[PDB]
């Protein structure tokens, strides 16, 4: 299914404008993309959570039908920017204190992160394919290390700014499925533009976690990872076969999160492409679960 979920709407935020998907009433269910994705990455798994809360599905700024940031460059887009906005988009959103969090690749850094600071309003945190903790390149997936190798450095403008190589070559390549004609047109849409309206997805490359830098996002990643690894609050681990991301030491340490139910799906990186039905199946047998009658 290529069609949207639900319609967007949108909010003035910072000045900016960002794009969200909103539906149903209820304690949220906050479904968050990554790089070089959008809300459209849900559009078949939110369905299975219809009456189970308030589905929102938010575009990060300068992604999806969200605004562009102006003057961009190298310096824009890098983890603290994008969580500056977002922030203040879920607290204008007013999600209450029982938000149950499904996350995605720098979704569920983002994600994670928020959690840790607003652990009290967190009922349960869904994720896969995660930025659970720092890493080395040893642990980064060997098909496509020494291209996101390139994107952090100065080959890195070429590549995506110019070519557009994450969403045409990155994201086609990590799915199992072949993609429709209309299905890569939503995900090509926002950076249709040669030049900085593809930054974002050059900048999230360049802010991963690997071999200590950034240290800032090594820091943030190290606080919640040290964190998720203790708290008690309802985990579901999404695995996948053969995955891509949350493999090997990574995904050693997510199995040992606490209070978590796991769950294998088929798929490399965008699993939500390759599993939809089985993955929103399971998410929402663990919102009925935190949500009882
Ligand atoms: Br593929
Ligand atoms: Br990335």
């Known amino acids: 299914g290529a069609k949207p979920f639900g319609e967007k709407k949108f909010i003035e935020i910072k000045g900016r404008r960002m794009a969200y998907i909103d539906?149903?009433?209820?304690?949220?269910?906050?479904?968050?993309?990554?790089?070089?994705?959008?809300?459209?990455?849900?559009?078949?798994?939110?369905?299975?959570?219809?009456?189970?809360?308030?589905?929102?599905?938010?575009?990060?700024?300068?992604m999806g039908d969200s605004d562009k940031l102006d003057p961009s460059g190298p310096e824009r887009y890098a983890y603290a920017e994008h969580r500056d906005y977002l922030d203040?988009?879920?607290?204008?959103?007013?999600?209450?204190?029982?938000?149950?969090?499904?996350?995605?690749?720098?979704?569920?850094?983002?994600?994670?992160?928020?959690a840790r600071r607003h652990?009290?309003?967190?009922?349960?945190?869904?994720?896969?394919?995660?930025?659970?903790?720092?890493?080395?390149w040893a642990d980064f997936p060997e098909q496509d290390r020494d291209l996101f190798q390139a994107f952090r450095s100065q080959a890195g403008e070429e590549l995506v700014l110019q070519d557009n190589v994450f969403v045409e070559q990155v994201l086609p390549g990590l799915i199992?499925?072949?993609?429709?004609?209309?299905?890569?047109?939503?995900?090509?849409?926002?950076?249709?533009?040669?030049?900085?309206a593809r930054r974002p997805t050059l900048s999230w490359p360049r802010q991963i976690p690997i071999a200590g830098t950034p240290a800032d996002v090594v820091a943030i990643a190290r606080?919640?990872?040290?964190?998720?690894?203790?708290?008690?609050?309802?985990?579901?681990?999404?695995?996948?076969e053969p995955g891509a991301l949350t493999t090997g030491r990574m995904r050693d340490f997510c199995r040992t999160w606490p209070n978590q139910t796991e769950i294998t799906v088929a798929g490399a990186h965008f699993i939500q492409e390759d599993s939809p039905d089985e993955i929103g199946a399971a998410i929402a047998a663990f919102v009925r679960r935190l949500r009882p009658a």
């Open 119 to 136: 652990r009290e309003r967190v009922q349960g945190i869904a994720y896969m394919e995660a930025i659970a903790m720092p890493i080395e």
């Open 23 to 62: 539906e149903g009433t209820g304690d949220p269910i906050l479904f968050q993309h990554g790089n070089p994705t959008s809300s459209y990455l849900w559009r078949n798994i939110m369905p299975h959570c219809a009456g189970l809360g308030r589905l929102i599905a938010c575009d990060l700024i300068g």
């Open 223 to 240: 606080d919640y990872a040290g964190w998720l690894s203790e708290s008690p609050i309802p985990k579901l681990f999404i695995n996948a």
């Open 176 to 196: 199992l499925r072949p993609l429709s004609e209309a299905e890569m047109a939503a995900y090509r849409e926002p950076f249709l533009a040669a030049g900085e």
């Open 88 to 114: 203040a988009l879920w607290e204008a959103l007013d999600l209450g204190d029982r938000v149950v969090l499904v996350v995605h690749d720098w979704g569920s850094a983002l994600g994670f992160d928020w």
